[PDB]
Write an enzyme that holds these catalytic residues in place. Structure first.
Site, PDB file in Angstrom:
ATOM      1  N   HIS A   9      -7.944  -3.164  10.182  1.00 43.93           N
ATOM      2  CA  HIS A   9      -6.877  -2.460   9.468  1.00 43.93           C
ATOM      3  C   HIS A   9      -7.312  -1.823   8.155  1.00 43.93           C
ATOM      4  O   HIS A   9      -6.718  -0.821   7.762  1.00 43.93           O
ATOM      5  CB  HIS A   9      -5.651  -3.363   9.245  1.00 43.93           C
ATOM      6  CG  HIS A   9      -4.396  -2.592   8.986  1.00 43.93           C
ATOM      7  ND1 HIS A   9      -3.949  -1.637   9.867  1.00 43.93           N
ATOM      8  CD2 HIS A   9      -3.541  -2.660   7.936  1.00 43.93           C
ATOM      9  CE1 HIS A   9      -2.844  -1.134   9.332  1.00 43.93           C
ATOM     10  NE2 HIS A   9      -2.553  -1.726   8.174  1.00 43.93           N
ATOM     11  N   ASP A  31      -8.561  -3.286  15.100  1.00 47.47           N
ATOM     12  CA  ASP A  31      -7.447  -3.581  14.224  1.00 47.47           C
ATOM     13  C   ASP A  31      -6.596  -4.706  14.858  1.00 47.47           C
ATOM     14  O   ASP A  31      -5.937  -4.485  15.860  1.00 47.47           O
ATOM     15  CB  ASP A  31      -6.621  -2.312  13.954  1.00 47.47           C
ATOM     16  CG  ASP A  31      -5.678  -2.413  12.775  1.00 47.47           C
ATOM     17  OD1 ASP A  31      -5.117  -3.530  12.543  1.00 47.47           O
ATOM     18  OD2 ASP A  31      -5.382  -1.361  12.164  1.00 47.47           O
ATOM     19  N   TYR A  53       3.493   5.243   0.966  1.00 45.95           N
ATOM     20  CA  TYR A  53       3.471   3.893   1.543  1.00 45.95           C
ATOM     21  C   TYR A  53       4.894   3.656   2.010  1.00 45.95           C
ATOM     22  O   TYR A  53       5.156   3.784   3.205  1.00 45.95           O
ATOM     23  CB  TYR A  53       2.899   2.801   0.633  1.00 45.95           C
ATOM     24  CG  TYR A  53       2.752   1.509   1.408  1.00 45.95           C
ATOM     25  CD1 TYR A  53       1.729   1.349   2.353  1.00 45.95           C
ATOM     26  CD2 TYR A  53       3.732   0.526   1.342  1.00 45.95           C
ATOM     27  CE1 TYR A  53       1.617   0.173   3.103  1.00 45.95           C
ATOM     28  CE2 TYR A  53       3.642  -0.641   2.103  1.00 45.95           C
ATOM     29  CZ  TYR A  53       2.554  -0.839   2.936  1.00 45.95           C
ATOM     30  OH  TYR A  53       2.494  -2.007   3.660  1.00 45.95           O
ATOM     31  N   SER A  81      -1.169   2.520   7.202  1.00 44.30           N
ATOM     32  CA  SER A  81      -0.396   1.342   7.557  1.00 44.30           C
ATOM     33  C   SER A  81       1.117   1.707   7.597  1.00 44.30           C
ATOM     34  O   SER A  81       1.462   2.631   8.326  1.00 44.30           O
ATOM     35  CB  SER A  81      -0.757   0.218   6.574  1.00 44.30           C
ATOM     36  OG  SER A  81      -0.167  -0.998   6.975  1.00 44.30           O
ATOM     37  N   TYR A  82       1.995   1.072   6.794  1.00 45.29           N
ATOM     38  CA  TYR A  82       3.415   1.496   6.758  1.00 45.29           C
ATOM     39  C   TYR A  82       3.503   2.990   6.364  1.00 45.29           C
ATOM     40  O   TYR A  82       4.329   3.715   6.904  1.00 45.29           O
ATOM     41  CB  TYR A  82       4.234   0.620   5.785  1.00 45.29           C
ATOM     42  CG  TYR A  82       5.726   0.690   6.058  1.00 45.29           C
ATOM     43  CD1 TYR A  82       6.475   1.813   5.689  1.00 45.29           C
ATOM     44  CD2 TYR A  82       6.384  -0.350   6.708  1.00 45.29           C
ATOM     45  CE1 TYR A  82       7.845   1.890   5.959  1.00 45.29           C
ATOM     46  CE2 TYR A  82       7.757  -0.288   6.971  1.00 45.29           C
ATOM     47  CZ  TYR A  82       8.479   0.837   6.601  1.00 45.29           C
ATOM     48  OH  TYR A  82       9.824   0.895   6.850  1.00 45.29           O
TER      49      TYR A  82
HETATM   50  C1  LIG Z   1       4.092 -10.771  -3.625  1.00 40.43           C
HETATM   51  S1  LIG Z   1       3.741 -11.845  -2.290  1.00 40.43           S
HETATM   52  O1  LIG Z   1       2.527 -12.546  -2.561  1.00 40.43           O
HETATM   53  O2  LIG Z   1       4.915 -12.580  -1.945  1.00 40.43           O
HETATM   54  N1  LIG Z   1       3.367 -10.745  -1.060  1.00 40.43           N
HETATM   55  C2  LIG Z   1       2.992  -9.439  -1.165  1.00 40.43           C
HETATM   56  C3  LIG Z   1       2.851  -8.955   0.086  1.00 40.43           C
HETATM   57  C4  LIG Z   1       3.108 -10.028   0.933  1.00 40.43           C
HETATM   58  N2  LIG Z   1       3.426 -11.118   0.271  1.00 40.43           N
HETATM   59  C5  LIG Z   1       2.970  -9.647   2.338  1.00 40.43           C
HETATM   60  N3  LIG Z   1       2.216  -8.299   2.212  1.00 40.43           N
HETATM   61  C6  LIG Z   1       2.503  -7.350   3.346  1.00 40.43           C
HETATM   62  C7  LIG Z   1       1.775  -6.051   3.100  1.00 40.43           C
HETATM   63  O3  LIG Z   1       1.997  -5.143   4.175  1.00 40.43           O
HETATM   64  C8  LIG Z   1       1.481  -5.659   5.413  1.00 40.43           C
HETATM   65  C9  LIG Z   1       1.568  -4.563   6.444  1.00 40.43           C
HETATM   66  C10 LIG Z   1       2.766  -3.882   6.653  1.00 40.43           C
HETATM   67  C11 LIG Z   1       2.857  -2.989   7.684  1.00 40.43           C
HETATM   68  F1  LIG Z   1       4.019  -2.355   7.919  1.00 40.43           F
HETATM   69  C12 LIG Z   1       1.801  -2.747   8.511  1.00 40.43           C
HETATM   70  F2  LIG Z   1       1.931  -1.805   9.463  1.00 40.43           F
HETATM   71  C13 LIG Z   1       0.608  -3.402   8.353  1.00 40.43           C
HETATM   72  C14 LIG Z   1       0.528  -4.301   7.320  1.00 40.43           C
HETATM   73  F3  LIG Z   1      -0.638  -4.966   7.150  1.00 40.43           F
HETATM   74  C15 LIG Z   1       2.236  -6.921   5.790  1.00 40.43           C
HETATM   75  N4  LIG Z   1       1.728  -7.492   7.074  1.00 40.43           N
HETATM   76  C16 LIG Z   1       2.075  -7.957   4.680  1.00 40.43           C
HETATM   77  C17 LIG Z   1       2.584  -7.722   0.791  1.00 40.43           C
END
Ligand SMILES: CS(=O)(=O)n1cc2c(n1)CN([C@H]1CO[C@H](c3cc(F)c(F)cc3F)[C@@H](N)C1)C2
Ligand SMILES: *[C@@H]1O[C@H](CO)[C@@H](O[C@@H]2O[C@H](CO)[C@@H](O)[C@H](O)[C@H]2NC(C)=O)[C@H](O)[C@H]1NC(C)=O
Ligand SMILES: *[C@@H]1O[C@H](CO)[C@@H](O[C@@H]2O[C@H](CO)[C@@H](O)[C@H](O)[C@H]2NC(C)=O)[C@H](O)[C@H]1NC(C)=O
Ligand SMILES: *[C@@H]1O[C@H](CO)[C@@H](O[C@@H]2O[C@H](CO)[C@@H](O)[C@H](O)[C@H]2NC(C)=O)[C@H](O)[C@H]1NC(C)=O
Ligand SMILES: *[C@@H]1O[C@H](CO)[C@@H](O[C@@H]2O[C@H](CO)[C@@H](O)[C@H](O)[C@H]2NC(C)=O)[C@H](O)[C@H]1NC(C)=O
Ligand SMILES: *[C@@H]1O[C@H](CO)[C@@H](O[C@@H]2O[C@H](CO)[C@@H](O)[C@H](O)[C@H]2NC(C)=O)[C@H](O)[C@H]1NC(C)=O
Ligand SMILES: CS(=O)(=O)n1cc2c(n1)CN([C@H]1CO[C@H](c3cc(F)c(F)cc3F)[C@@H](N)C1)C2
Ligand SMILES: *[C@@H]1O[C@H](CO)[C@@H](O)[C@H](O)[C@H]1NC(C)=O
Ligand SMILES: *[C@@H]1O[C@H](CO)[C@@H](O)[C@H](O)[C@H]1NC(C)=O
Ligand SMILES: *[C@@H]1O[C@H](CO)[C@@H](O)[C@H](O)[C@H]1NC(C)=O
Ligand SMILES: *[C@@H]1O[C@H](CO)[C@@H](O)[C@H](O)[C@H]1NC(C)=O
Ligand SMILES: *[C@@H]1O[C@H](CO)[C@@H](O)[C@H](O)[C@H]1NC(C)=O
Ligand SMILES: *[C@@H]1O[C@H](CO)[C@@H](O)[C@H](O)[C@H]1NC(C)=O
Ligand SMILES: *[C@@H]1O[C@H](CO)[C@@H](O)[C@H](O)[C@H]1NC(C)=O
Ligand SMILES: *[C@@H]1O[C@H](CO)[C@@H](O)[C@H](O)[C@H]1NC(C)=O
Ligand code: NA
Lengths: 728, 727
Positions: free
Chosen positions: B701, B669, B508, B591-592
């Protein structure tokens, strides 16, 4: 010991076929481009002069795509900034060069983004389309007269076709027709107001942050179609003070009753035009013959000069009603039509008589009428040796129909069995182009006594290169099914041994009026598979195939995805029973209509095929365009043919793919067979738990023809076939 | 004994049991047993049928979910559930009167309602329909309209737009009731100039023309939505024709440029706290606003304004942390990064700028779970210095030296990863242990921290698994540049260190990610290790979370650098361990993780034979503004454009000639646009690199529909097996 014809040879064009593309400028001279120089040749003697030096436009500052010399030889239209649109459409910038004063015209230039341009057939008038409107220039340096003012992007098309007319009706973007001496300019107007839009993403260069959405008015089967109007303008009475008057020619009452198409425009004389109209149910067409009336300034189409062409077994014409060939006085014409036995032959009509007389007959077909004089009509047919996949030039004596002479049959029967022809302006000379089974051969002939003047190009350089390569051979033969012969071809590996078992790939198209078994010489992917990989590449022409009469062609009427699919399975079953085929290694592949047939075959549950590849396939006829689909299928309504539209999808056969290895490929920017068609196949396979291979080609269209995508697709398919056949 | 097969994974043969309860008060919770809703007494464990399995047999619709009003007088029934993005969806709702035992048929909640919420006390409702807010004081009475500006894809009142839903609030809702429900606070988002992402949606095969889906989505450096904040007094609704929504404007330090509203927390009945974040996300401001009863306005004293900024990176893990107010609303606790870069709890007086840290150490506080007058309860990874473990702690507010671990020693072999659910006034708590052993759910009384009972111990699954050759899991660290970097390995059963195994690196590696932990999982890796004898490894390198800012902020302004290099280095380190076949090292990620896999496959390292990228990012300018800019700044020549252009997958296309690659992406997506993989494939075609591809029609996604999920894992299993020459 010798090298084989490799995948790199195919992809890098190592072995090139030479052509001899000439442009007739009169009854005795032609233009030919040699070393970027345009030369003029005398047909009688073969002597030439330089018409235009390659250095003339060294300081032009633009790469010239193409050129068009005015019919009087005074001007040259220079095409540059070419931007392709669909199969035939494109936009470009134009410059005119005066060949007498040796100068580029700088005044009143044709604008950039011009959609279509054409010289009048005599002299040097120009007609062009820009922003969907027609303009006429009487002289290249003079201001343009604007003919139409209604032109609107994606809505009103004047003098150019919309998507479906370009692809399916005219095989051209132009919808302009000059009268024989340039007095009148006839044109069609298309109205796409209520035609639904197909929308798809275009990604462009990596630098583009947001993808573009391309929107094209495209009527799918049963959808609202564009409407059409036809006009004729006198270009000799144009005024700078007053707007041009276009005279409309309305469609006959039998067409106006419902949806219809304009399908052919042919000028008969200086003041007589013929138009053919086709009903949306494409088994009824009407030809109108219209005369200019000097007193009223109107065009009148007498009901006594109306000709009906209908079909009780299928649609009219091969892809559309055929074009008429008028005599010099325009009082009569020759046209290819289906006879009472269902074979396409030449019929001779009087403009004001209902019954026509067939001038040719037999269990073979006329392919096309090529030239007409007061004494002879010249045509191409597959009569010779009863081979439907062969083509020869014939002439028929108009005063005695029993006097038919074959002009190309015996020139070189071993090397040449497939010809096309180019006649000079009044048929005094003709160029024959032999395209197979041997290397292409271009020759020049005089009509008076059919003298073979000279060899223009014999491909002897390629013949010398190919003697050092282990080339495959081609077998053209037939199988008998229910008392009917059906032809096939096989590309056989070099040193073919009938005691050995070879894997076999069935190369399919099988669309209505298709022909995949012929005498043409080709250097393609199959040449590589047979030469390097020792794979037999076979093709078969079953029910629905062309040039063998309507009993065969119309067998799939209202029933696509039935007999033509069953016949490919039957051909493979028959080839699999031959001693030289490994029945554990039979594959199938096709592109476009062939991708649909390949997918229908792979989903049949026949068990004959181990694997297959579908490239840009149709998957459901409701997703394809109205003009092509409805011609064969009728309308997708409960009152017409909806049940067969629903029974003939690839998606309904998804469970049967469990027994095969399938590779599905499609360009994301395909404006023709939308990516949607393969997106629905993959979703149906996923839904039933069938594993398969896929490949999308970003921003490629129906041709997947960009240099890098073409190399990538054939590389990817070669790995797949080799893996399927256990070939290292 | 059988192994854990791909079909066991895809058909969910070995099911993990859960114990999902809903607290309704300080001593009662709701639990679903055999489709009946039971009410349990937390102290004694005795139950009663709250709502019979048959109550809604003749409802005429399948009920997706329900919600009981806080006073227990009504039940909100959710049906006609239509999913939208990660959190958003639309639905129909009916209200059932629990006293009268009848469905309310008058003044029904409209169809296509976007969001609905009960007031925290009583039974008022606020809902969003056609992008406007509505309030019902009584379930059968007419609604009061709150906003008239709602407009599809343009003005969102009380609901978030795409980017606020995904990146700021992790919720569709943008409504916040005051504690006793007098006030309704809400945000309004304006997407007028936000560009749209457009993509085709094919739908059922009966659809003749595909649909074009159009969503306001700001990509990196594009025009962002703007936001406004309002508070309405709902108690005035039945007294005035049109109750005024009072705006609370952002501070001057935010109004100077682009900004975000990032947190809304009510402190008391008449005090609200708002957190704002600058578009350059290393500066945040908290405003504390009081209701002024004489003017009917909300005033935010500058003396109560709190600044949170970062010199090494962005503010917060993904956003600034929420405050937890003491009952009088005069002080609050908040997790912030200390002087050493470790996230700890700080105690603030509302009008004093300097806070007092109540926790410290080389470990981090994960979250504040409950606050009473005497104790604060929190989760941290302090125990045994394991960043991948989680335990519940209790700190005495009158004496910070008195910190008790409530979960550390309950079952240390089986349970090292806890989450907790407290009753309404923290009288009871449910502990949820999720690994390294089988999940275990237990109930406890806060009065004495005594275990009341085991709610679910997964003994049925334990019995089933005894007949299966299960893989084992190793969690450990390697020392790189005097820093510990944690990894985990899913090891085949009968693991023999003298044998060379193929290795799959599961990646990841996004900012604040954690792939090395103590959680028990039954997943694809379980099958790969158990049936295929593949070691599945994961590594937490630079940019990973829960280990301090020195590690987390190492990739600040430099995505696609250290976190990619550290995965390559992890594979070299695993090879050095002696039980890895160096000719059979693969890498995969979603994803990432797909971006990192692709960057690794394009690095020219020579370490990896093959790899799979699922829905990868390929170029940071294609991803959304809020997430991307937090780590990368702006893609302008004045800020960070050179790195945005240097960190694309496309620029490494030539190096893919050295590997076998499988690229997979869903066509619908909305998050990582199909465009991202369409650009990878085009760059590979342009340099003549052969690779494998798979699109998933109409999948988003998550590629999570039942059939696509089974298809993708089957396709990936064939690819990995072919790469590793496994029959
Ligand atoms: C602990 S919290 O409640 O403050 N919290 C956890 C997450 C978030 N907030 C935001 N979330 C991220 C997870 O990866 C997502 C994500 C990252 C990427 F690089 C991507 F390509 C697609 C993708 F969906 C982000 N858009 C949101 C992870
Ligand atoms: C193109 O076709 C449209 C219809 O598809 C024409 O528009 C109609 O015009 C009449 C008046 O002439 C109106 O009563 C209709 O309501 C119009 N329909 C729509 C959908 O606009 C249009 O005039 C045609 N244009 C040309 C230049 O022929
Ligand atoms: C092209 O053909 C047109 C149509 O027949 C010719 O126009 C006619 O010419 C005659 C003789 O000058 C006139 O009596 C008619 O009135 C003209 N008719 C029209 C409609 O203009 C025209 O002269 C021919 N042009 C060339 C270059 O031969
Ligand atoms: C042209 O097309 C259809 C082909 O089906 C014929 O349509 C008739 O109408 C429906 C089909 O929609 C059938 O119930 C009729 O039986 C069809 N007629 C016949 C005679 O089969 C139409 O007749 C064909 N026209 C011609 C000239 O053959
Ligand atoms: C949402 O933001 C847009 C600006 O992006 C506002 O639209 C402007 O409104 C003013 C005042 O009516 C007009 O003068 C401008 O022409 C509008 N600009 C654009 C680009 O449309 C809009 O009013 C805002 N909406 C709300 C409810 O706050
Ligand atoms: C909920 O809290 C609000 C806000 O404190 C209470 O409303 C105030 O109540 C006092 C009386 O105690 C009045 O003098 C104020 O005018 C009210 N303010 C507003 C803004 O309405 C409300 O009474 C509390 N509700 C309950 C049920 O206790
Ligand atoms: C001899 S002629 O000049 O009258 N003529 C030949 C053709 C045409 N006219 C029309 N052309 C057809 C070839 O197959 C095309 C075609 C057919 C398909 F079924 C398809 F999926 C995609 C596709 F591109 C048709 N749209 C046009 C073939
Ligand atoms: C060819 O030769 C003839 C006779 O010598 C001459 O009149 C003619 O102009 C020549 N043609 C060309 C095109 O050079
Ligand atoms: C075509 O485009 C060029 C470049 O924009 C411009 O200089 C030229 O004038 C244009 N030609 C015409 C005829 O408009
Ligand atoms: C020609 O028609 C157009 C469009 O109706 C109009 O704008 C123009 O003024 C007309 N010109 C003359 C000379 O009438
Ligand atoms: C549990 O037991 C108590 C005491 O017997 C009883 O009063 C209460 O109603 C019970 N609770 C439930 C939810 O059944
Ligand atoms: C109620 O729920 C289900 C039917 O949905 C049934 O299996 C069960 O036996 C019923 N009764 C109880 C006491 O759970
Ligand atoms: C929701 O839709 C159904 C079907 O159109 C309709 O019968 C019902 O009355 C609607 N509900 C409301 C609250 O409008
Ligand atoms: C209520 O007040 C707001 C704010 O002034 C206004 O925009 C809205 O139109 C009003 N609604 C009515 C009068 O129903
Ligand atoms: C925020 O980040 C930018 C870019 O790194 C930097 O110029 C600025 O000084 C930082 N602000 C603070 C408050 O540290
Ligand atoms: Na000769």
């Amino acid at each position: 010991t010798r090298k084989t014809y490799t995948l790199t040879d195919y992809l890098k064009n190592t072995y090139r076929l030479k052509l001899y593309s000439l442009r007739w400028i009169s009854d005795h001279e032609y233009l030919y481009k040699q070393e970027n120089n345009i030369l003029v040749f005398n047909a009688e003697y073969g002597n030439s002069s330089v018409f235009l030096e390659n250095s003339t436009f060294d300081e032009f500052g633009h790469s010239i795509n193409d050129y068009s010399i005015s019919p009087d030889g005074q001007f040259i239209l220079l095409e540059y900034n070419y931007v392709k649109q669909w199969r035939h459409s494109y936009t470009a910038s134009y410059d005119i060069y005066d060949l007498n004063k040796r100068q580029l015209i700088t005044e009143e230039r044709i604008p950039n983004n011009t959609q279509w341009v054409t010289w009048s057939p005599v002299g040097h008038k120009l007609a062009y389309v820009w922003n969907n409107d027609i303009y006429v220039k009487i002289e290249p340096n003079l201001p343009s007269y604007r003919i139409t003012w209604t032109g609107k992007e994606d809505i009103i098309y004047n003098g150019i076709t919309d998507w479906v007319y370009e692809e399916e009706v005219f095989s051209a973007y132009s919808a302009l027709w000059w009268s024989p001496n340039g007095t009148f300019l006839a044109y069609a107007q298309f109205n796409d107001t209520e035609v639904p839009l197909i929308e798809y993403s275009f990604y462009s260069d990596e630098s583009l942050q947001y993808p573009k959405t391309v929107r094209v008015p495209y009527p799918k089967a049963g959808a609202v179609n564009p409407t059409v109007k036809f006009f004729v303008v006198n270009t000799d009475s144009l005024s700078s003070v007053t707007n041009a008057t276009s005279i409309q020619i309305t469609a006959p009452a039998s067409m106006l009753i419902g949806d219809h198409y304009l399908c052919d425009v042919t000028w008969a004389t200086q003041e007589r035009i013929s138009l053919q109209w086709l009903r949306r149910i494409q088994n009824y067409s009407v030809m109108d013959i219209c005369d200019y009336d000097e007193s009223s300034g109107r065009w009148n189409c007498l009901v006594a000069r109306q000709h009906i062409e209908m079909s009780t077994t299928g649609w009219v014409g091969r892809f559309r009603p055929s074009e008429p060939h008028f005599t010099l006085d325009g009082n009569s014409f020759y046209k290819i039509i289906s006879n009472e036995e269902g074979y396409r032959h030449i019929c001779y009509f009087q403009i004001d008589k209902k019954d026509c007389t067939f001038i040719t007959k037999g269990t073979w077909e006329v392919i096309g009428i090529e030239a007409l004089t007061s004494d002879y009509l010249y045509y191409i047919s597959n009569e010779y040796k009863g081979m439907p996949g062969g083509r020869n030039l014939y002439k028929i004596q108009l005063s005695d129909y029993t006097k038919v002479t074959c002009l190309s049959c015996e020139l070189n029967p071993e090397r040449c069995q497939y010809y096309s022809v180019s006649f000079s302006k009044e048929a005094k000379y003709y160029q024959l182009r032999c395209s197979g089974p041997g290397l292409p051969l271009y020759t020049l002939h005089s009509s008076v006594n059919d003298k073979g003047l000279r060899v223009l190009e014999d491909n002897s350089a390629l013949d010398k290169m190919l003697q050092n390569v282990q080339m495959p051979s081609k077998k053209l033969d037939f199988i008998i099914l229910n008392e009917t012969k059906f032809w096939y071809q096989m590309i056989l590996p070099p040193h073919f041994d009938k005691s050995k078992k070879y894997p076999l790939l069935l190369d399919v198209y099988a669309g209505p009026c298709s022909q995949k078994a012929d005498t043409v010489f080709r250097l393609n992917w199959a040449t590589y598979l047979a030469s390097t990989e020792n794979i037999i590449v076979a093709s078969f022409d079953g029910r629905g195939s062309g040039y063998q009469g309507d009993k065969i062609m119309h067998a799939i009427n209202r029933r696509l995805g039935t007999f033509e699919v069953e016949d490919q399975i039957e051909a493979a079953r028959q080839f699999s029973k031959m001693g030289f085929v490994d029945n554990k290694r039979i594959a199938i592949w096709g592109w476009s209509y062939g991708g649909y047939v390949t997918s229908m075959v792979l989903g049949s549950g026949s068990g004959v095929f181990k694997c297959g590849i579908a490239v840009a396939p149709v998957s459901r006829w409701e997703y394809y365009d109205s003009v092509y689909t409805e011609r064969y299928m009728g309308l997708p309504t409960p009152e017409d043919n909806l049940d067969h539209y629903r029974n003939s999808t690839v998606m309904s056969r998804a469970e049967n793919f469990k027994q095969v290895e399938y590779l599905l490929i499609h360009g994301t920017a395909d404006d023709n067979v939308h990516f949607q068609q393969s997106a629905q196949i993959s979703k149906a396979l996923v839904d039933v738990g069938v594993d398969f291979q896929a490949m999308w080609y970003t921003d490629e269209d129906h041709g997947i023809a960009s240099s890098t995508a073409h190399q990538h697709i054939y590389t990817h398919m070669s790995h797949f076939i080799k893996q399927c056949f256990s070939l290292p």
